[PDB]
Amino acid sequence: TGAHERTFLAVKPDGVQRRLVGEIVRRFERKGFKLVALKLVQASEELLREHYAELRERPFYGRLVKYMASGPVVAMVWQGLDVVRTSRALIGATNPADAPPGTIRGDFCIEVGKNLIHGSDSVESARREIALWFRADELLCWEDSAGHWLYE
Amino acid sequence: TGAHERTFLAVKPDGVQRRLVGEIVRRFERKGFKLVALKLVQASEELLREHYAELRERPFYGRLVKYMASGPVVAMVWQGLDVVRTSRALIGATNPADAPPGTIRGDFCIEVGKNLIHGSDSVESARREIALWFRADELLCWEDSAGHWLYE
Amino acid sequence: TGAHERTFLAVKPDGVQRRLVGEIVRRFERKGFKLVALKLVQASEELLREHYAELRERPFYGRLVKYMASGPVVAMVWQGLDVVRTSRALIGATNPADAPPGTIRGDFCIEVGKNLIHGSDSVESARREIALWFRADELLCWEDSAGHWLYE
Amino acid sequence: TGAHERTFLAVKPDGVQRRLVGEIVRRFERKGFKLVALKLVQASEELLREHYAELRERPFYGRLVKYMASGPVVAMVWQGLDVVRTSRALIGATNPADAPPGTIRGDFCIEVGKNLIHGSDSVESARREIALWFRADELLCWEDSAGHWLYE
Amino acid sequence: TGAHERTFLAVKPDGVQRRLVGEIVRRFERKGFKLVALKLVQASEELLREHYAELRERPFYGRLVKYMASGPVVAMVWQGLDVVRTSRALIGATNPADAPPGTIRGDFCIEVGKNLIHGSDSVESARREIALWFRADELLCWEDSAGHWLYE
Amino acid sequence: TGAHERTFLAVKPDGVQRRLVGEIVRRFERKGFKLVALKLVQASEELLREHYAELRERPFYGRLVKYMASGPVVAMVWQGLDVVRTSRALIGATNPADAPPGTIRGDFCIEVGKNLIHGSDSVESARREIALWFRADELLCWEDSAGHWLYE
Ligand SMILES: Nc1ncnc2c1ncn2[C@@H]1O[C@H](COP(=O)(O)OP(=O)(O)O)[C@@H](O)[C@H]1O
Ligand SMILES: Nc1ncnc2c1ncn2[C@@H]1O[C@H](COP(=O)(O)OP(=O)(O)O)[C@@H](O)[C@H]1O
Ligand SMILES: Nc1ncnc2c1ncn2[C@@H]1O[C@H](COP(=O)(O)OP(=O)(O)O)[C@@H](O)[C@H]1O
Ligand SMILES: Nc1ncnc2c1ncn2[C@@H]1O[C@H](COP(=O)(O)OP(=O)(O)O)[C@@H](O)[C@H]1O
Ligand SMILES: Nc1ncnc2c1ncn2[C@@H]1O[C@H](COP(=O)(O)OP(=O)(O)O)[C@@H](O)[C@H]1O
Ligand SMILES: Nc1ncnc2c1ncn2[C@@H]1O[C@H](COP(=O)(O)OP(=O)(O)O)[C@@H](O)[C@H]1O
Ligand SMILES: [Mg+2]
Ligand SMILES: [Mg+2]
Ligand SMILES: [Mg+2]
Ligand SMILES: [Mg+2]
Ligand SMILES: [Mg+2]
Ligand SMILES: [Mg+2]
Numbered sequence: 001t002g003a004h005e006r007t008f009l010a011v012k013p014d015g016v017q018r019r020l021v022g023e024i025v026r027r028f029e030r031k032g033f034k035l036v037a038l039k040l041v042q043a044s045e046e047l048l049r050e051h052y053a054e055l056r057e058r059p060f061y062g063r064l065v066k067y068m069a070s071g072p073v074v075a076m077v078w079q080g081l082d083v084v085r086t087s088r089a090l091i092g093a094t095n096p097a098d099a100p101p102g103t104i105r106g107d108f109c110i111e112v113g114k115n116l117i118h119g120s121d122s123v124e125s126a127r128r129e130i131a132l133w134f135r136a137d138e139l140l141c142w143e144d145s146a147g148h149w150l151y152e
Numbered sequence: 153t154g155a156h157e158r159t160f161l162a163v164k165p166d167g168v169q170r171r172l173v174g175e176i177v178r179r180f181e182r183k184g185f186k187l188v189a190l191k192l193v194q195a196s197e198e199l200l201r202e203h204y205a206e207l208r209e210r211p212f213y214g215r216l217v218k219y220m221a222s223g224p225v226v227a228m229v230w231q232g233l234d235v236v237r238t239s240r241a242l243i244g245a246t247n248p249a250d251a252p253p254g255t256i257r258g259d260f261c262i263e264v265g266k267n268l269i270h271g272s273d274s275v276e277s278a279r280r281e282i283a284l285w286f287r288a289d290e291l292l293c294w295e296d297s298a299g300h301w302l303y304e
Numbered sequence: 305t306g307a308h309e310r311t312f313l314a315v316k317p318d319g320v321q322r323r324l325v326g327e328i329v330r331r332f333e334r335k336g337f338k339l340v341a342l343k344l345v346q347a348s349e350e351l352l353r354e355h356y357a358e359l360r361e362r363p364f365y366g367r368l369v370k371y372m373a374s375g376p377v378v379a380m381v382w383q384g385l386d387v388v389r390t391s392r393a394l395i396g397a398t399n400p401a402d403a404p405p406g407t408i409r410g411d412f413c414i415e416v417g418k419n420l421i422h423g424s425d426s427v428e429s430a431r432r433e434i435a436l437w438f439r440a441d442e443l444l445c446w447e448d449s450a451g452h453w454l455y456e
Numbered sequence: 457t458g459a460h461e462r463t464f465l466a467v468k469p470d471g472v473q474r475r476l477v478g479e480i481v482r483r484f485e486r487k488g489f490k491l492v493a494l495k496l497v498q499a500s501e502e503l504l505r506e507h508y509a510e511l512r513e514r515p516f517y518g519r520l521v522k523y524m525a526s527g528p529v530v531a532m533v534w535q536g537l538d539v540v541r542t543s544r545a546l547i548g549a550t551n552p553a554d555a556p557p558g559t560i561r562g563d564f565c566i567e568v569g570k571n572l573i574h575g576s577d578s579v580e581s582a583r584r585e586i587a588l589w590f591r592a593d594e595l596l597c598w599e600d601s602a603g604h605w606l607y608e
Numbered sequence: 609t610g611a612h613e614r615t616f617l618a619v620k621p622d623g624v625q626r627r628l629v630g631e632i633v634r635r636f637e638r639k640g641f642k643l644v645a646l647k648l649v650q651a652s653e654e655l656l657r658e659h660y661a662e663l664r665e666r667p668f669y670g671r672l673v674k675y676m677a678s679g680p681v682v683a684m685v686w687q688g689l690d691v692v693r694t695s696r697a698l699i700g701a702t703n704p705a706d707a708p709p710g711t712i713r714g715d716f717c718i719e720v721g722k723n724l725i726h727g728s729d730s731v732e733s734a735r736r737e738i739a740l741w742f743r744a745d746e747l748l749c750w751e752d753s754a755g756h757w758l759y760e
Numbered sequence: 761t762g763a764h765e766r767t768f769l770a771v772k773p774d775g776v777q778r779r780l781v782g783e784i785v786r787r788f789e790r791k792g793f794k795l796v797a798l799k800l801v802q803a804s805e806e807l808l809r810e811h812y813a814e815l816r817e818r819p820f821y822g823r824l825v826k827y828m829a830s831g832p833v834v835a836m837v838w839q840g841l842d843v844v845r846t847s848r849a850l851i852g853a854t855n856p857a858d859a860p861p862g863t864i865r866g867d868f869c870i871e872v873g874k875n876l877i878h879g880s881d882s883v884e885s886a887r888r889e890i891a892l893w894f895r896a897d898e899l900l901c902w903e904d905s906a907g908h909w910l911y912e
Contacts, residue, residue: 014757017297021187022178029171032870038226040190042292063760072292074190081870082857090861097690101698102710102862110640110689113760140194140224145169145601149774152823152873166605184414215608233414234401242405249538253546254406254558262488262537265608297753301318304367304417321753323637330630336566339629342682344646346748376748378646385566386553394557406558444650444680449625449905453470456519456569473905477795478786485779494834496798498900528900530798596802596832601777622909671912705842709850710862718792718841721912 003151006036006077006139007084008129009091010118013071016040020108021074024117027090027104028078032150037077037130037139045069050132060113067113075133081151084126087119155303158188158229158291159236160281161243162270165223168192172260173226176269179242179256180230184302189229189291197221202284212265219265227285233303236278239271307455310340310381310443311388312433314422317375320344324412325378328421331394331408332382336454341381341434341443349373355436364417371417379437385455388430391423459607462492462533462595463540464585466574469527472496476564477530480573483546483560484534488606493533493586493595501525507588516569523569531589537607540582543575611759614644614685614747615692616737618726621679624648628716629682632725635698635712636686640758645685645738645747653677658740668721675721683741689759692734695727763911766796766837767844768889770878773831776800780868781834784877787850787864788838792910797837797890797899805829810892820873827873835893841911844886847879 009028011021029035043051048065055061078087092103095112099105109115120126130139161180163173181187195203200217207213230239244255247264251257261267272278282291313332315325333339347355352369359365382391396407400419403410413419424430434443465484467477485491499507504521511517534543548559551568555561565571576582586595617636619629636643651659656673663669686695700711704723707714717723728734738747769788771781788795803811808825815821838847852863856875859866869875880886890899 013294016187016294017757018754019181019298022174022176022181024174025177026174027867029174030868032868035168035173035192035224038190038192039290040187040292042294072187072294086857086870089866092861097694100708100710100860100862101700101714102708102860102866106697106710106861107635108638108640110694110758111760114758138191140192142168142194142224145604146171146778148601149777150870150874152871169605170602179411182412184412238401238414241410244405249542252404252406252556252558253548253562254404254410254556258405258545258558259483260486260488262542262606263608266606297756298322300753301321302414302418304415320643320750323754325643326630326632326634326637328630329633331563333627333630334564336564339624339648339680342646342648343746344643344748346750376643376750390553390566393562396557404556404558406556406562410557442647444648446624446650446680449908450474450627452905453473454566454570456567472795472902475789475906478782478784478789480782481785482782485782491776491781491800491832494798494800495898496795496900498902528795528902594799596800598776598802598831602779625909626906675912705846708860708862709852709866710860714849714862715787716790716792718846718910719912722910 003081004079005081005083005123006079006130007087007120007126008118008133009076009078009087009120010133011074011076012068012116012118013073014114015116016072016074018108020116023108024104025076028087031086031090032080032146033083033087034079034144034147035076036079036141037134038074039134039138040072040074042072043069047132051129077130077134077139084120084123088121091117091119155233156231157233157235157275158231158282159239159272159278160270160285161228161230161239161272162285163226163228164220164268164270165225166266167268168224168226170260172268175260176256177228180239183238183242184232184298185235185239186231186294186296186299187228188231188293189286190226191290192224192226194224195221195227199284203281215265229282229286229291236272236275240273243269243271307385308383309385309387309427310383310434311391311424311430312422312437313380313382313391313424314437315378315380316372316420316422317377318418319420320376320378322412324420327412328408329380332391335390335394336384336450337387337391338383338446338448338451339380340383340445341379341438343379343438343442344376345379346376347373351436355433367417381434381438381443388424388427392425395421395423459537460535461537461539461579462535462586463543463576463582464574464589465532465534465543465576466589467530467532468524468572468574469529470570471572472528472530474564476572479564480560481532484543487542487546488602489534489536489539489543490600490603491532492535492597493590494530495594496528496530498528499525503588507585519569533586533590533595540576540579544577547573547575611689612687613689613691613731614687614738615695615728615734616726616741617684617686617695617728618741619682619684620676620724620726621681622722623724624680624682626716628724631716632712633684636695639694639698640688640754641691641695642687642750642752642755643684644687644749645683645742647683647746648680649683650680651677655740659737671721685738685742685747692728692731696729699725699727763841764839765841765843765883766839766890767847767880767886768878768893769836769838769847769880770893771834771836772828772876772878773833774874775876776832776834778868780876783868784864785836788847791846791850792906793838793840793843793847794902794904794907795836796839796901797835797894799835799894799898800832801835802832803829807892811889823873837890837894837899844880844883848881851877851879
């Protein structure tokens with residue numbers, strides 16, 4: 001897919017509550033990525049248990065699911081070259097204490113449980129997460145007039 | 153409704169294309185308003201013709217509808233005291249040439265046909281537009297921890 | 305006093321709680337005014353009752369005093385030409401609904417009771433307020449290297 | 457000329473010294489205007505005396521000319537619909553004390569002699585000033601990919 | 609102390625003179641740390657010689673003390689989990705040439721002697737510096753309504 | 761030359777088209793570097809072939825030259841201690857995928873061909889590039905009043 005690669009990002013409840021949705025979106029916009037889906041949702045525990053299926057054996061799993069179900073999240077899909085890996089780099093390490101200044105977590109967060117945002121960790125994860133959170137008809141193709149200035 | 157008043161805002165295609173979605177959202181966030189719904193959509197001509205029903209006899213109606221249907225828009229609902237009138241003030245006059253610096257249109261736009269954003273013009277318009285664009289289950293009630301610092 | 309005019313500003317508890325101290329300070333810094341005093345304090349009811357002596361007959365007086373005593377404020381003195389009147393303009397109208405975008409209240413606030421900041425309303429008020437909140441030895445004289453580029 | 461209208465702007469020495477060149481340029485860029493010329497120069501007294509010929513009888517003329525010749529200025533030409541009048545609005549009133557917050561002078565200046573920037577006051581003034589400061593071969597025609605999103 | 613850990617920061621004279629006090633405070637605010645003390649002061653040589661006691665053998669010690677005593681500084685205490693180590697990371701390396709973009713020194717400074725800010729290098733250093741610069745009654749306890757969104 | 765070291769930077773056509781000229785200039789301004797030359801130009805292929813002489817055997821050379829000649833660039837000279845190496849660090853790695861957040865390319869770009877800006881790679885390169893792009897009389901000496909706060 002190359003430049004058509006996509007990732008799933010979600011602003012977590014702490015990001016909404018601390019009024020950082022615009023700030024986060026703006027960082028992906030200024031980087032050059034293309035927004036292809038967006039909605040504010042209250043995720044069910046059922047969806048979240050599937051979202052985090054791979055973490056089912058971790059001791060924080062129960063609390064992570066409860067937390068993510070506790071308030072609104074902003075679900076998003078972004079498109080562009082290497083968007084999965086690059087998004088992860090813009091977000092910064094899982095634990096904000098390891099995330100350098102300049103990253104979202106490095107600039108805005110302190111603790112692993114309140115780290116503002118989720119990003120898919122691979123192309124395959126993004127495929128799964130996009131399908132889980134969004135119908136095909138919520139993913140928009142639009143002609144991106146900036147593309148000429150971001151890509152050869 | 154008082155502090156529960158709501159308005160409908162939409163970032164128009166020019167706002168998406170020029171990468172101002174985050175910028176716009178951030179201005180409503182920093183003002184203190186509560187985001188209660190959000191989605192990126194491709195609006196149909198049918199929806200837009202009803203959205204702009206009051207302008208049906210004006211000669212720009214056709215091209216307004218075509219333009220708004222020509223690319224993705226970011227549909228939003230914001231909640232708070234006097235949110236309809238205050239949102240209109242943050243956005244600025246219809247014609248950007250009359251919108252002072254500090255407003256969205258005053259800072260970011262030049263011409264009336266490319267003026268970035270729609271806001272409801274009254275509480276009754278907001279009522280109609282919210283129902284037209286969003287189901288009840290897309291409008292989220294969340295406990296706003298900032299509310300104590302915005303309201304008495 | 306001319307360019308030596310001074311005003312008293314205070315970031316109110318809502319400004320501290322919403323993390324807008326730096327934002328506010330930065331607006332006075334970028335304007336060209338000279339910071340001559342600064343401290344984070346918890347104001348007593350006794351001080352606040354005198355600070356707001358002129359409002360003693362108003363129905364919001366009791367609640368205003370209690371609120372301002374309820375949490376830390378950032379007390380400040382700024383110096384420069386016409387600083388009292390210009391600070392009031394940067395802050396915006398008492399009621400944020402009347403404060404245009406570009407002002408502190410217009411950009412960041414909604415309601416008259418949670419309006420972020422106090423500014424002296426006149427040179428006489430500033431005289432009184434500066435004396436009430438700060439000792440002479442908390443007001444600092446420093447050689448301002450920017451002064452040649454702000455003043456003729 | 458319509459959307460091909462042009463104005464002459466100059467960041468004055470105080471704007472260079474206070475490091476606000478980027479800030480100012482960014483405000484015209486975000487507004488949608490097209491940059492068609494730009495250079496850092498040290499203007500001669502001869503040029504400045506002609507630039508300000510209409511102010512020759514005013515008491516500040518001598519000091520204005522000397523000051524503008526005392527350091528580098530950033531000379532610019534911007535193009536777009538109503539750019540002369542709109543530029544003046546973004547800049548704000550001559551005397552910064554009358555320039556509201558949101559404008560360049562309202563946000564960044566205090567005194568009439570140190571007011572950061574010059575803008576042409578009319579289409580005829582811009583014609584004269586552009587010719588005086590720039591050769592025809594310093595004014596660049598480029599295909600503006602944003603134009604589709606700023607104009608009908 | 610965990611989340612009650614505290615560090616001492618000081619904006620040095622160059623930070624005040626270049627008008628970066630707001631900018632610096634804003635970076636600590638947006639990170640989530642809690643401001644518990646703040647004042648603008650002119651530090652004595654006596655205090656500064658003790659502040660920098662560990663550097664007494666170094667060749668820049670005399671000049672460092674003189675410089676820090678030469679103009680106002682903004683003394684601060686910040687509270688939060690791992691605040692001492694994280695503050696140092698937000699500030700960046702001692703020598704700004706080694707401080708990456710995104711850090712305060714990486715974004716705003718060039719030279720080791722003009723590096724904007726001091727931060728305690730350990731919990732014990734912070735304890736000592738807090739006691740040296742502030743009385744107990746200048747350190748404020750306030751109920752932090754954002755804490756729920758920064759900490760588990 | 762020490763603090764008199766100079767580098768050549770150029771905002772490439774993508775930086776002009778995406779409206780990031782002010783943003784880029786502002787980063788060099790806030791760092792403390794001194795702007796000593798600036799112009800918007802349309803570079804000839806002849807000049808660009810010499811500019812990029814060392815890359816003549818690389819497969820992108822033809823397309824790089826054509827691209828850089830295809831639209832306006834903003835040519836600049838900046839002065840200060842270690843400005844060549846530090847500029848390169850602020851810009852970030854050639855390939856934006858390797859450029860961390862906080863850098864220009866890390867924040868604003870995706871692909872190596874659309875990476876916003878050129879910076880000299882050494883003191884000798886800067887010497888050559890400055891002479892190639894600018895006459896001696898376009899390089900300005902001005903007294904930098906901020907220098908006392910950037911340098912010891
Ligand atoms: N030790 C922990 N305690 C609490 N929450 C944790 C912990 N480790 C991870 N989490 C949370 O779970 C989320 C998912 O964990 P994981 O998938 O391993 O990391 P990532 O989100 O970086 O892919 C994290 O982003 C974080 O909010
Ligand atoms: N003369 C015009 N030509 C083109 N578009 C127009 C014209 N007048 C208004 N419009 C467009 O129609 C939209 C709706 O018009 P109106 O409802 O009167 O204004 P507003 O959006 O400020 O409530 C405007 O926001 C603008 O984009
Ligand atoms: N009607 C009101 N209800 C609640 N609080 C009010 C009301 N009017 C004023 N206040 C509060 O009292 C403060 C002081 O009032 P006043 O001195 O008249 O205004 P200002 O602060 O603009 O000088 C206001 O800034 C506001 O926070
Ligand atoms: N009384 C004054 N003292 C000092 N400088 C002044 C005075 N009046 C005007 N100036 C300066 O002269 C410039 C040109 O004056 P004028 O052309 O009337 O204003 P404008 O710049 O708004 O077109 C102003 O921008 C200001 O910098
Ligand atoms: N070689 C030097 N020349 C001048 N000043 C220096 C030098 N090295 C360090 N300093 C200054 O002394 C301060 C204290 O030194 P040190 O305690 O090592 O650094 P830090 O502030 O990073 O803990 C530095 O922040 C810097 O301003
Ligand atoms: N593989 C490539 N494909 C396309 N363009 C490239 C490639 N490698 C380099 N370039 C472009 O050519 C410019 C010059 O390359 P080079 O001089 O090696 O890098 P730098 O700009 O870091 O000094 C780069 O900045 C980039 O825009
Ligand atoms: Mg994960
Ligand atoms: Mg309307
Ligand atoms: Mg009052
Ligand atoms: Mg004039
Ligand atoms: Mg130290
Ligand atoms: Mg190179």
